């Protein structure tokens, strides 16, 4: 089998157990759903999900081996309610009967898997992500949690890699067949919430191979993703992020048609607990179609216009049609049907691994075969001979074209972009 005993998934504006065992799922009015299989646990009282497992079929009494897998997205701390953020722990999923079973909790930047046997004995294992990174790859972004249990070790894997281990030999009989309650439960703030996707309970200790494969499979999509992990949308407003220059951002140079590269403003307050680089900075960009359009979701290989808002107007990102050197500065300008420029971009995901990055390829014709260059950041000449001075600019380069063909794909490339929309899970 798939060794699966619970499989919540989405159907007809509801959640449902598709494991094949027909558990009874009850979703109250406080839980928000979407067709992309996500659901949101809020602070309000009626924001819970009760699952009544099937007591009438299999051996619903205890498990020596079992795993729990799901995707999650956890909002960033409030810049003032930091003390509350660190101090208060709260339960999100609870499965107890007769004061025994498992529960999953969150204390600030730490996520916790706790076991309790019938004797009252308790044991925990957790995962903590740094809250001082200039760019955090876990905060407010979707990642993949898997928790494997036998009778020796409780393990926590994040995105396919083992991240934590705990000895549970002292741990004895655990009661599994209790009601499963998805609810924010603790000393939380009014503005507290959690996003979850693809919840599944297995009756086996999944191997690292099985877990990594499950991660790759559930991570796959025909469409592209933004900075947080959600689908990448046409006609939506975005900031831009360079995977190779984490601390940099684009700004239209004063009295100029080119793109300057400046440094991200950081957390400038006097907490000695946290640190981040501002994300809602730089020119506000926006993706447009180029014409079977359907939904406003940006898919791979689609042809697009990269526009952005300057003052009170939508401008476009062009390139000069024939430039001599390896690379050339990009030409930002009002929207025109011009002769000297290409305006059409083909959006690619050259990476074979689960990533949130995409790349921008300039082509001659959408029917053609010749490739101009990729979009990135380059260091151009600027000043005098006495003292060499160079400057980072919003560029198009032919150099990336051969680099993308290198395997395994280099994540730190400058042709790798990620789009950052305003999200209620990120304040600054």
């Amino acid at each position: 089998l798939n060794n699966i005993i619970l499989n919540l998934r989405y159907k007809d504006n509801n959640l449902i157990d598709l494991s094949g065992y027909g558990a009874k799922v009850e979703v109250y009015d406080g839980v928000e759903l979407n067709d992309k299989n996500q659901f949101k646990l809020t602070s309000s009282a009626n924001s819970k999900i009760r699952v009544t497992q099937n007591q009438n079929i299999i051996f619903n009494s205890v498990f020596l081996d079992f795993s729990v897998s799901f995707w999650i997205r956890i909002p960033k701390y409030k810049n003032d309610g930091i003390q509350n953020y660190i101090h208060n722990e709260y339960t999100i999923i609870n499965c107890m009967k007769n004061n025994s079973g498992w529960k999953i909790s969150i204390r600030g930047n730490r996520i916790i898997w706790t076991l309790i046997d019938i004797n009252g004995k308790t044991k925990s294992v957790f995962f903590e992500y740094n809250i001082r990174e200039d760019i955090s790859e876990y905060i407010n972004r979707w990642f993949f949690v898997t928790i494997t249990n036998n009778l020796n070790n409780a393990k926590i894997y994040i995105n396919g890699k083992l991240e934590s281990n705990t000895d549970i030999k002292d741990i004895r009989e655990v009661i599994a067949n209790g009601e499963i309650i998805f609810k924010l439960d603790g000393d939380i703030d009014r503005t507290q919430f959690i996003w979850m996707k693809y919840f599944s309970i297995f009756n086996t200790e999944l191997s690292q191979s099985n877990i990594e494969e499950r991660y790759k499979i559930q991570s796959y999509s025909e469409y592209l993703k933004d900075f947080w992990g959600n689908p990448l949308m046409y006609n939506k407003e975005y900031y831009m992020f360079n995977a190779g220059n984490k601390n940099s951002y684009i700004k239209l140079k004063k009295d100029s048609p080119v793109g300057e590269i400046l440094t991200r403003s950081k957390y400038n307050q006097n907490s000695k607990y946290i640190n981040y680089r501002d994300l809602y900075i730089g020119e506000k960009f926006i993706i447009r179609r180029k014409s079977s359009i359907n939904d406003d979701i940006v898919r791979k290989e689609d042809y697009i216009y990269l526009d952005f808002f300057n003052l009170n107007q939508e401008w476009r990102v062009y390139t000069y049609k024939y430039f001599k050197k390896e690379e050339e500065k990009l030409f930002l300008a009002p929207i025109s049907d011009s002769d000297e420029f290409y305006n059409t971009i083909q959006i690619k995901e050259y990476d074979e691994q689960p990533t949130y990055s995409c790349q921008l390829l300039f082509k001659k014709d959408e029917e053609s075969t010749d490739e101009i260059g990729l979009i990135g950041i380059h260091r151009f000449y600027e000043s005098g001979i006495v003292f060499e001075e160079y400057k980072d600019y919003f560029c198009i380069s032919k150099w990336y074209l051969k680099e993308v063909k290198r395997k395994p794909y280099n994540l730190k490339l400058g042709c790798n972009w990620q789009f950052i929309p305003k999200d209620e899970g990120w304040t600054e």
């Epitope: 009295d255 100029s256 080119v258 000069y320 050339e328 500065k329 005098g384």
Partner: nanobody
Framework: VQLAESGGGLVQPGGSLRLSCEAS????????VGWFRQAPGKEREGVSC????????TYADSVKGRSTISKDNAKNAVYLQMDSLRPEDTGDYYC???????????????????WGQGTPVTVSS
């Protein structure tokens, strides 16, 4: 980082004149370069421009046949030869450097970053 500007002033309708500029400040190899004329009662207009190398230069239609333009990477300088002058080509003349190497078909003041300070030419009776 400024641009020196040379070339004479007063000439008679039909003559010729050479205007030059020295790159005292930055190196000049990798930047396209342009010339702009501004007559009294008008806004600055492009006359001619050259690629960062020598791939090809573009001219305004009126002087199209008349003027020719050159660039020296050794002397770090750029020159504009204007022949058979008209009594209309009179005004202040300026030079500038582009952000890009390519010299586009049409000439936009937006692309050019340095300027200063201006050498005047006059064509009249």
């Amino acid at each position: 980082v400024q641009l020196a500007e040379s070339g004479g002033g007063l000439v008679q309708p039909g003559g010729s004149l050479r205007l030059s500029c020295e790159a005292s400040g930055f190196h000049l190899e990798h930047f396209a370069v342009g010339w702009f004329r501004q007559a009294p009662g008008k806004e600055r207009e492009g006359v001619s421009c050259i690629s960062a190398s020598g791939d090809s230069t573009t001219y305004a239609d009126s002087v199209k046949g008349r003027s020719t333009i050159s660039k020296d990477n050794a002397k770090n300088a750029v020159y504009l030869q204007m022949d058979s002058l008209r009594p209309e080509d009179t005004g202040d003349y300026y030079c500038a450097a582009s952000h890009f190497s390519v010299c586009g078909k049409n000439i936009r003041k937006i692309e050019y970053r340095y300027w200063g300070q201006g050498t005047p030419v006059t064509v009249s009776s």
